[PDB]
Amino acid sequence: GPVHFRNQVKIRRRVDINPGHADLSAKEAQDVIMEVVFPNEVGARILTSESQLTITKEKKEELQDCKISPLMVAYMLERELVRKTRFLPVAGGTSSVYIEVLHLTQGTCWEQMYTPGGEVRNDDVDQSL
Amino acid sequence: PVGISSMVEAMVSRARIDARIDFESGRIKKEEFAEIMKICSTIEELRRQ
Amino acid sequence: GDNTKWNENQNPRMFLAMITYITRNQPEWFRNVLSIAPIMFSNKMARLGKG
Amino acid sequence: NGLTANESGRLIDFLKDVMESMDKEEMEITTHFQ
Amino acid sequence: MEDFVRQCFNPMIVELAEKAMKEYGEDLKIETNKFAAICTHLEVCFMYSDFHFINERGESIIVESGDPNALLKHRFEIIEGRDRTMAWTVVNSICNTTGAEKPKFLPDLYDYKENRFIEIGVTRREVHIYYLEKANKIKSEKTHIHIFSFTGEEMATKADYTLDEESRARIKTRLFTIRQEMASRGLWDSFRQSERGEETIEERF
């Protein structure tokens, strides 16, 4: 929509870069990745949490016969599941889907109204409300 | 990888376990399980010597 | 500001003193393992170069 | 040379071997030629 | 003590004992009773496992020495004396094959008839305190427990004993032989003193 030329108060803030993070840390999610792809090399780590257990059953089905590389399938599940944070000058925004386009939505003198395509979760919407 | 076991020892033991589990429930029938166990014994003997 | 000859004036003996102060009331093995590096730097030698 | 504690795959054992190499009366290295 | 423990036990057991004790970075010289404890544990597990093979059914058939034939199948896969990574990979393979339960602590062997793990133990103190220690340590357990004593009396859960009585008599003979050669050496009490120390090892840099 319309571009609004206005002073941008870009406040440096830690903001989540990844937009599909299942709220699991890198070490926390490496064990789910192993249980999905490498079920015999997991070690003593027992996946107590129910969220990890649902993620395992659902993800196992999709990758039944993938023939790219199990290392690439593991890096895939790393990208989808591993959380990531980065200090970034942010004004407005602060969402997962609005920070991946922060080079397009925010400038030094201009604001760009934008609405990503994905169906938005209503928790974020009510927080903003 | 982590451990303390030597290359050949880990490889032969892992293969032995795989043959055992495949024989109990898997593709491997007695012939291939026996061949694998014999070859692994040969590898262990050659390692010790 | 900036510091002139920063590295030249940073004695490893005062890094050993700082490490000994930081590691007070701690297992002696930890104190020794953290002290070893300043000990090696205090006695360090430098190769002159290519020639 | 006989300092094989570093085969434990722990950094502190490699440092114990490095420290125990200095209390040895003779190191043994190898040099290439042609 | 090192001379005796190097002489009596065969080289495979003492080898595995330095292997296991070194795995954690423990020094054989500053901690010497531990090496003998590990050697005894390894030997008793190997003896509990050896001289046992499986038939088409269960109810292990015993032999003096294994016969050369297709019956290569072994009754017990000895998890003890294995690297931690491979130990947990064999455990995971078993759990994924038989759908069994995953223990919280490393078991020592696995049996297919009753289809579950076994955790052998050897203790200086008599049975009914180390047994309850192991039991309240291994909480929510299915792994059978079978602890021995140097005197000659053992115990287990459900009063269950997973093998013949002659093999138990052999184990007991070996342990009594060790005990009454220790009595001659005077080492026995030295071993006795450090049981509490056994629980944990302190770093020494």
Side-chain angles (χ1 to χ4, degrees), chain B residues 2-5 10 13-14 17 20-21 23-25 33-34, chain E residues 19 22-23 72-74 77 82-83 85-86 89-90 97 112:
Chain B
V2 303
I4 190 167
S5 305
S13 299
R14 175 47 156 70
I17 299 310
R20 176 38 172 287
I21 297 309
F23 180 110
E24 182 145 290
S25 315
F33 161 82
Chain E
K19 206 63 191 83
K22 196 276 209 186
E23 183 185 10
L72 303 161
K73 300 302 310 298
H74 288 337
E77 293 81 3
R82 201 145 297 183
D83 183 75
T85 301
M86 194 200 328
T89 286
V90 60
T97 298
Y112 294 60

Side-chain angles (χ1 to χ4, degrees), chain E residues 120-180:
Chain E
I120 303 305
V122 169
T123 316
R124 296 76 154 187
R125 283 73 42 79
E126 83 304 345
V127 295
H128 183 71
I129 75 170
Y130 209 87
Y131 186 106
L132 200 45
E133 288 173 40
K134 293 214 91 57
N136 292 93
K137 177 79 160 70
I138 314 165
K139 287 320 287 173
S140 198
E141 63 257 59
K142 300 315 148 295
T143 81
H144 177 266
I145 311 303
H146 184 25
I147 293 165
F148 262 58
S149 173
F150 300 82
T151 312
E153 67 287 19
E154 61 260 45
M155 66 173 289
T157 176
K158 313 165 313 313
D160 186 318
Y161 292 163
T162 56
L163 79 173
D164 190 358
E165 182 42 69
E166 60 82 11
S167 43
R168 309 173 218 168
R170 179 70 274 172
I171 293 166
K172 295 150 130 182
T173 318
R174 183 102 187 88
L175 278 296
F176 182 76
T177 305
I178 298 305
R179 194 262 282 279
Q180 67 95 59

Side-chain angles (χ1 to χ4, degrees), chain A residues 51-62:
Chain A
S51 61
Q52 301 192 320
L53 193 156
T54 175
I55 297 168
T56 55
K57 302 143 190 59
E58 181 271 299
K59 275 286 203 200
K60 282 201 261 203
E61 283 295 4
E62 291 185 9

Side-chain angles (χ1 to χ4, degrees), chain A residues 95 97-98 115-126 128:
Chain A
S95 181
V97 288
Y98 280 88
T115 81
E119 287 82 3
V120 187
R121 310 179 168 191
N122 68 5
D123 291 331
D124 301 355
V125 186
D126 53 55
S128 302

Side-chain angles (χ1 to χ4, degrees), chain A residues 62-81:
Chain A
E62 291 185 9
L63 323 173
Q64 213 83 30
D65 198 358
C66 274
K67 54 152 190 54
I68 296 87
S69 296
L71 174 49
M72 264 300 168
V73 167
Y75 188 42
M76 164 187 71
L77 294 199
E78 277 190 30
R79 306 180 267 220
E80 175 172 343
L81 301 191

Side-chain angles (χ1 to χ4, degrees), chain A residues 3-75:
Chain A
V3 171
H4 288 320
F5 275 100
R6 54 167 51 210
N7 178 317
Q8 292 296 306
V9 55
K10 292 198 147 183
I11 296 298
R12 295 179 173 74
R13 187 209 329 290
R14 181 176 274 308
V15 65
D16 293 350
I17 193 66
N18 213 356
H21 62 276
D23 297 69
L24 301 181
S25 164
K27 254 55 192 162
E28 187 161 50
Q30 183 175 133
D31 280 339
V32 65
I33 296 163
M34 277 208 85
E35 188 59 24
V36 166
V37 180
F38 310 110
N40 307 282
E41 309 294 328
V42 73
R45 284 310 330 300
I46 187 65
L47 284 72
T48 177
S49 298
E50 200 51 22
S51 61
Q52 301 192 320
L53 193 156
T54 175
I55 297 168
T56 55
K57 302 143 190 59
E58 181 271 299
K59 275 286 203 200
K60 282 201 261 203
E61 283 295 4
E62 291 185 9
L63 323 173
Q64 213 83 30
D65 198 358
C66 274
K67 54 152 190 54
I68 296 87
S69 296
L71 174 49
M72 264 300 168
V73 167
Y75 188 42

Side-chain angles (χ1 to χ4, degrees), chain C residues 29 32-33, chain E residues 202-203 205:
Chain C
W29 67 268
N32 297 326
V33 63
Chain E
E202 181 59 26
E203 278 294 6
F205 194 107

